[PDB]
Design a protein around this ligand. Structure first.
Ligand code: MG
Ligand code: MG
Ligand code: MG
Lengths: 109, 51, 56, 199, 236
RNA sequence: CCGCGGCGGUGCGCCGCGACCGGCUCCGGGACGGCUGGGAAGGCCCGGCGGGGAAGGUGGCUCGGCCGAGUGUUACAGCCCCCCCGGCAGCAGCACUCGCCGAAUCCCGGGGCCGAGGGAGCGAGACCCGUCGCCGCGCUCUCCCCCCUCCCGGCGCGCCGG
RNA sequence: CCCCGGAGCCCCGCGGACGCUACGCCGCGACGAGUAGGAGGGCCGCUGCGGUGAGCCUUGAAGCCUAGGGCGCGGGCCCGGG
RNA sequence: GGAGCCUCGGUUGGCCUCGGAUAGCCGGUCCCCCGCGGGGUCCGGUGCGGAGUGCCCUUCGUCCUGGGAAACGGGGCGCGGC
């Protein structure tokens, strides 16, 4: 009856200064800021969840306007608890500075 | 042929050098032996502390 | 000198290099030492008939 | 869902740095009491540094050239604008989240407002070092509304002192209330200190 | 048909040796001194006039395709799911409590009953309390809370297994084309055996849960992440 | 037509799992060697031998209630410290993490990630298939016994006989 | 101590691919910047000739156009509709 | 109150002293001064801040009946005045 996903912001792509490598998102998971606090989140399912003009299908549901791009937090990115993700398609860039949901549900807990 | 890494893949190590089996049979047993003997020292030290 | 790092390897170093990255030169084709049949075929005329002999 | 940061006691660029990254991660921020921001380095030092910035103008038509904003809010906005990619769409979007004020006006004058302790003067400077209030600085470079901003803030502080007195009054009654009731909240109050509050 | 005369030391390393095993197995004293055309192989039947007829079991085919794929390469160690070994997080022990993370029973709290043959969990958030029946779940989509009921001596039915907790309907042909055929059928009906199973199991648990104060109320409730509380910080 | 029997290729579209191997990156455990056959330490205390700061001391003065606190001097040991002789098991590169270098003197278990890329059966009365090398084992064709007990059988949940 | 028109086959010397356009097919290694310049291959492309497709074509050739479907690393190509 | 294109972000709230930093916070004043408060002194508490943003508030299944502790609290987009 509430929220079963931890909040996270799409920081932007894995990139060098002047070559962005679009196939790898970086994820600022809310409340975690140490390459330490982040072994929880390794290998968790994650959703860029967004809605669009035309209708879609929906697993166990009637046709909707919301769509998602699924992905997976792979590894911890640099000291201050950023995390790398990788998504079944690359994230839009429209997406920068927006919510992506890091689930709990490939749990090892 | 795929190179399976001997150092991870026990049976590949054995294929290349069968004396590994024994060397590793020893050094499980050896380490267990000594681990037991450490507990036995620790129990005697606790008994000496109680006395 | 300023093109290399070098020095005196351990026993373990010689093992780890040979087992993890031991590749024969066998008819000028870099081939991985998957069996002693390879080492023997080439070095067996010296008494070297296995990975272990090679390491020694 | 929104930062409100009391810019008093902070350091101009030090705060702006932190605000920029918040703003780039979609955080809507408000920065309040910007005249109270204070800049390291003795006053005179910084006045000249501003006065130099004033000199910078597009010779052939100043009307185009770098617009030197006087108000401390706009100054602080300018320095945060200098740490975003503000020529981009995403940069421009980022600034649109940030909302700066000389003094502390009516939405936020009854909101609790945070303090970035990593930009704070008492922490980041040696006590024997000198600094400048961005107000004074703003005032002398042509900011019109110092005194107005002062006269409105004396009202606010008087208005707030009242709120605090009533707040205190409730807190006090609540401390009394517990003592009045502490045999019929005793086996609740016990359980809230096995799992470690109330201590 | 004796068991394994050397035990396991490590996966792939027996405790003993070659030489100890020779003596244990006793290879001394167990020394084994041991120094078509006309006749048709596999057809044959009966029959009347002329005589008996020689049939041919497995008769050569009446169509060859124009091209067909050519074998594979043996491949060593690739077991089918049934023959797999099954794991279980040490956290999940019998009569522990879970938070089911994924399905319709989502965030609902539950009691864990057993690991089935499959490797799935069997589960019950006693239908009574929670509205979660006898039900399968996966280890991987479940949080093993550090809260246990003592479920030791409850006789879960032997007959309830993977095979029973398994979806049922739909065959092939019928009328098919039009605006009909198995878009209806409509409802999974609960059945009476299923209701009887639940009734039996819950009663054994249900007293046990209650003994723990507030536990029923905990098992009624639903888990969800509020503000300021982060999975990685908190424990369950 | 029902068998979804045996084999072969497949999935309309979106999904998930599982175990096996390869390559990685981490985590947790343990067991060893060497040294100034580590240095310091701890613990027990005993007998001596001096030296130093500076003391349950004394003393000038000051500050508080003979006592407590703050400076100052000669300095023994009734606060300690340091050297020297002689001797105990508790040490152990020590979870009292004070300072190394390592591993035929080294092993076990666990997690995250990416990838699977090949295809030694195209016979007419008898397999549409295994498998090579390595590990051992495991088993049996040798007898013994012991235990537990899952199925089944028997006797009184207990005991006896795969 | 016997014969494969039958040992039943992990090797079979009695006969031999699903495979064998031998300018074909298959396996192992290694390597791959490039102006000027050189060489090879183009089932890349244009126009005409000898051959050849019992080719195609008023039941619609060439050309032209195409937010149609594809192939090829590419030169290019093939189909759908107009 | 009913349908119905489109644009999206979101997925508990926090309703506030002032400020200090070689200092602060809270009480209570027995006592004194000022306009239930404000200022003072004195005393008593806290101070790696529990009258803590390392915080607080809020609960997250629905109903039934039939006990206890808690109990006049909540509502009707309940309605008029200050
Ligand atoms: Mg080249
Ligand atoms: Mg050229
Ligand atoms: Mg939604």
């Amino acid at each position: 009856s509430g929220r079963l996903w931890c909040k996270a912001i799409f920081a932007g792509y894995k990139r060098g200064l002047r070559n962005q490598r679009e196939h790898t998102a970086l994820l600022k998971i809310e409340g975690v800021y140490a390459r330490d606090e982040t072994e929880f989140y390794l290998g968790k399912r994650c959703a860029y969840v967004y809605k669009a003009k035309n209708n879609t299908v929906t697993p166990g549901g009637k046709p909707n306007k919301t769509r998602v791009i699924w992905g997976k937090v792979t590894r911890a990115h640099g000291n201050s608890g950023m995390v790398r993700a990788k998504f079944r398609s690359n994230l839009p860039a429209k997406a920068i500075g927006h919510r992506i949901r890091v689930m709990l549900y490939p749990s090892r807990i | 042929v795929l190179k399976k890494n001997p150092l991870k893949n026990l049976r590949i190590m054995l294929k290349l050098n069968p004396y590994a089996k024994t060397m590793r049979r020893n050094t499980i047993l050896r380490q267990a032996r000594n681990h037991k003997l450490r507990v036995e020292r620790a129990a005697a030290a606790l008994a000496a502390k109680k006395s | 000198e300023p093109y290399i790092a070098w020095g005196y390897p351990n026993l373990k170093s010689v093992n780890e290099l040979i087992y993890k990255r031991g590749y024969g030169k066998i008819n000028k084709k870099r081939i991985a030492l998957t069996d002693n049949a390879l080492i023997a075929r080439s070095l067996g005329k010296y008494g070297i008939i296995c990975m272990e002999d090679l390491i020694h | 869902q929104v930062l409100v940061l009391d810019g008093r006691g902070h350091l101009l660029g030090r705060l702006a740095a932190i605000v920029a990254k918040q703003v780039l991660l979609g955080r809507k921020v408000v920065v309040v009491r910007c005249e109270g921001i204070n800049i390291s380095g003795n006053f005179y030092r910084n006045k000249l540094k501003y006065l130099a910035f004033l000199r910078k103008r597009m010779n052939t038509n100043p009307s185009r050239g770098p617009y030197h904003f006087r108000a401390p809010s706009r100054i602080f906005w300018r320095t945060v604008r200098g740490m975003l990619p503000h020529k981009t769409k995403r940069g421009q979007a980022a600034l649109d989240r940030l909302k700066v004020f000389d003094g502390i006006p009516p939405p936020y004058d009854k909101k609790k407002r945070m303090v970035v302790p990593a930009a704070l003067k008492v922490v980041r400077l040696k006590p024997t070092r000198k600094f400048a209030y961005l107000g004074r600085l703003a005032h002398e470079v042509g900011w019109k509304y110092q005194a107005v901003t002062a006269t409105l803030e004396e009202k606010r502080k008087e208005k707030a002192k009242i709120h605090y007195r009533k707040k205190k009054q409730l807190m006090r009654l609540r401390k009394q209330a517990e003592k009045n009731v502490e045999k019929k909240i005793d086996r609740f109050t016990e359980v809230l200190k096995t799992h470690g509050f109330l201590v | 048909p004796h068991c394994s005369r050397n035990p396991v030391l490590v996966r792939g390393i027996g405790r003993y040796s070659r030489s100890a095993m020779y003596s244990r197995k006793a290879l001394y004293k167990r020394k084994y001194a041991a120094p078509v055309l006309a006749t048709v192989t596999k057809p044959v039947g009966g029959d009347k006039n002329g005589g008996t007829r020689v049939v041919k079991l497995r008769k050569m085919p009446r169509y060859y395709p124009t091209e067909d794929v050519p074998r594979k390469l043996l491949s060593h160690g690739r077991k089918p799911f049934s023959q797999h070994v099954r794991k279980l997080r040490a956290s999940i022990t019998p009569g522990t409590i879970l938070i089911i993370l994924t399905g319709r029973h989502r965030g609902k709290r539950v009691v864990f009953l057993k690991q089935l043959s499959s490797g799935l969990l069997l589960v019950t958030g006693p239908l009574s309390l929670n509205r979660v029946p006898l039900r399968r779940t996966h280890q991987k989509f479940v949080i093993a809370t550090s809260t246990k009921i003592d479920i030791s001596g409850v006789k879960i039915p032997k007959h309830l297994t993977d095979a029973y907790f398994k979806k049922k309907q739909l065959r092939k042909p019928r009328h098919q084309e039009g605006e009909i055929f198995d878009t209806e059928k409509e409802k999974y009906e609960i059945t009476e055996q299923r209701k009887v199973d639940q009734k039996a199991v819950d009663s054994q648990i249900l007293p046990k849960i209650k003994a723990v104060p507030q536990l029923q109320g905990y098992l009624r409730s639903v888990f969800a992440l509020t503000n300021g509380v982060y999975p990685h910080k908190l424990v369950f």
